Short mmCIF file of C-alpha atoms in Angstrom, two decimals:
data_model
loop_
_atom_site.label_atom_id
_atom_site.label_comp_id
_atom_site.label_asym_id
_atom_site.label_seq_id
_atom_site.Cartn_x
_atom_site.Cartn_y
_atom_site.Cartn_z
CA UNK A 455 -22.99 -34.35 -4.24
CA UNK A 456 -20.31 -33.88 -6.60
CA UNK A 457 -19.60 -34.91 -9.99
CA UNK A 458 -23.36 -36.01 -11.64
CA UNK A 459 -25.23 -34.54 -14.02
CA UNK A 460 -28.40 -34.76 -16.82
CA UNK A 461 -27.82 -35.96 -20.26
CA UNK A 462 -29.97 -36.86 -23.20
CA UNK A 463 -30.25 -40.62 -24.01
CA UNK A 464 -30.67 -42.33 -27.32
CA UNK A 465 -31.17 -46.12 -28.43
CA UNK A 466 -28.50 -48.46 -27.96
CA UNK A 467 -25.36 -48.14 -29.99
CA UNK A 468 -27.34 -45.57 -32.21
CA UNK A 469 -24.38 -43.24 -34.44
CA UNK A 470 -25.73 -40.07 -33.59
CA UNK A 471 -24.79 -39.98 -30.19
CA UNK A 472 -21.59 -38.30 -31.12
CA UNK A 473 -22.95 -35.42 -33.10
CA UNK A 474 -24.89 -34.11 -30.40
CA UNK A 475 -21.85 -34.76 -27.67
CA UNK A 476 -19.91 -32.35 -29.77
CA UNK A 477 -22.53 -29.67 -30.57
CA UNK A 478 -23.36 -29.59 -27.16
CA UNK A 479 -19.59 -28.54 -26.24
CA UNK A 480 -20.09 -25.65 -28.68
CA UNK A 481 -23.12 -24.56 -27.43
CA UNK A 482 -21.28 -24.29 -23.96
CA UNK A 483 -18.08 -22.70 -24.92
CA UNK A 484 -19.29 -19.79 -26.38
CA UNK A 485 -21.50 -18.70 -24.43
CA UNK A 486 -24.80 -19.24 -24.28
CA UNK A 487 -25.92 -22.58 -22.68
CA UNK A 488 -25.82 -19.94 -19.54
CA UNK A 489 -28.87 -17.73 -20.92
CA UNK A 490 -31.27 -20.14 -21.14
CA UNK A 491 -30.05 -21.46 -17.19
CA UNK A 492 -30.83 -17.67 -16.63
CA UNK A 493 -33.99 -17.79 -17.82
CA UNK A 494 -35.85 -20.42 -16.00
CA UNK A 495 -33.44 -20.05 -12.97
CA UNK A 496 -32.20 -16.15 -12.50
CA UNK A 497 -31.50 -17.67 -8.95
CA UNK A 498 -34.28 -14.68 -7.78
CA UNK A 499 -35.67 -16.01 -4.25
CA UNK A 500 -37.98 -12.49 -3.58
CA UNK A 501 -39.04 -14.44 -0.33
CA UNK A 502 -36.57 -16.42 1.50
CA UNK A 503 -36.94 -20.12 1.60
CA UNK B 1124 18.47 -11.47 -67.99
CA UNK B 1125 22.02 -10.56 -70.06
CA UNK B 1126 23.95 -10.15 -67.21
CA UNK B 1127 21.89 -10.73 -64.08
CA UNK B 1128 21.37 -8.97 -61.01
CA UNK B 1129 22.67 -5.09 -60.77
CA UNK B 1130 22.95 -3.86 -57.16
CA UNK B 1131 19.41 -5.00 -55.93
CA UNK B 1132 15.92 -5.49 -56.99
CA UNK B 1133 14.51 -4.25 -53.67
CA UNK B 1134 15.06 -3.94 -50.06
CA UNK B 1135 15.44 -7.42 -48.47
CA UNK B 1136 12.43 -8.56 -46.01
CA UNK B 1137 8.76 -6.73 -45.14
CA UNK B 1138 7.84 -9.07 -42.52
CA UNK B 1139 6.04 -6.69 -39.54
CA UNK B 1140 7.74 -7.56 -35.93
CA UNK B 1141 5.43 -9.95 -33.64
CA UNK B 1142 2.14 -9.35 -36.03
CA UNK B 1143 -0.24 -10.85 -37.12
CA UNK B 1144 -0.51 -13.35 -34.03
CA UNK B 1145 -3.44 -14.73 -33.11
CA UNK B 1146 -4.02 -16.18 -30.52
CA UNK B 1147 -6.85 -18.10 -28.48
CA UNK B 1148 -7.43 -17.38 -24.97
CA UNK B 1149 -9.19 -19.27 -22.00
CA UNK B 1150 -10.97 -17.27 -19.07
CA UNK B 1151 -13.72 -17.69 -16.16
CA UNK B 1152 -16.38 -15.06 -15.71
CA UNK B 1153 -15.15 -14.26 -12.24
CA UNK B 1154 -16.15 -10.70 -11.35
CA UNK B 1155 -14.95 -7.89 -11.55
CA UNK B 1156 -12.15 -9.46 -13.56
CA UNK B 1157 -14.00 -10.37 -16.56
CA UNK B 1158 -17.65 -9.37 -17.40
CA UNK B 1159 -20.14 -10.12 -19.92
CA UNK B 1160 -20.77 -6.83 -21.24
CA UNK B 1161 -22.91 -7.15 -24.72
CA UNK B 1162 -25.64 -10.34 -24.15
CA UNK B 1163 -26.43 -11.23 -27.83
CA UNK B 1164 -27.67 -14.55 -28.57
CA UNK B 1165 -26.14 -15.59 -31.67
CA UNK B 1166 -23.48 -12.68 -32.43
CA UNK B 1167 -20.31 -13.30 -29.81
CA UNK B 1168 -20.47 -11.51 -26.74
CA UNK B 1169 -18.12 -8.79 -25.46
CA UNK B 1170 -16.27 -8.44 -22.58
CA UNK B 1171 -15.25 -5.41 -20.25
CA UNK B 1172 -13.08 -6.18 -17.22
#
């Protein structure tokens, strides 16, 4: 299914949604919202399922 | 400051050809084009491809 994702949800109309909608683009860019996806999920099947 | 200017000063211009560009660049980490080579956390990473 294309095009759907998680996100983090705050109270209604609360200001600091936009802080972390940027911040989160920087911690993308760079490089290094991919480590911790490499952590939990190294994508390392030993047995095949 | 009597009379002005006699033959030159200086040279004219000492502006180095096509230097000091920067310039910011856009990529995919599609192997073996472009690798992750250093996997620092905080320090950028570099990249051998």
């Amino acid at each position: 299914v294309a095009d759907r994702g998680y996100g983090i949800a705050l109270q209604h109309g609360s200001p600091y949604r936009d802080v972390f909608s940027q911040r989160i683009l920087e911690l993308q860019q760079n490089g290094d919202m991919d480590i911790l996806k490499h952590k939990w999920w190294p994508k390392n099947g030993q047995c095949d399922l | 400051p009597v009379t002005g200017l006699n033959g030159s000063l200086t040279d004219k211009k000492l502006e180095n050809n096509m230097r000091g560009v920067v310039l910011r660049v856009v990529t995919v980490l599609e192997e073996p084009f472009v690798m992750v080579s250093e996997n620092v956390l905080g320090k950028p990473k570099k990249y051998q491809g």
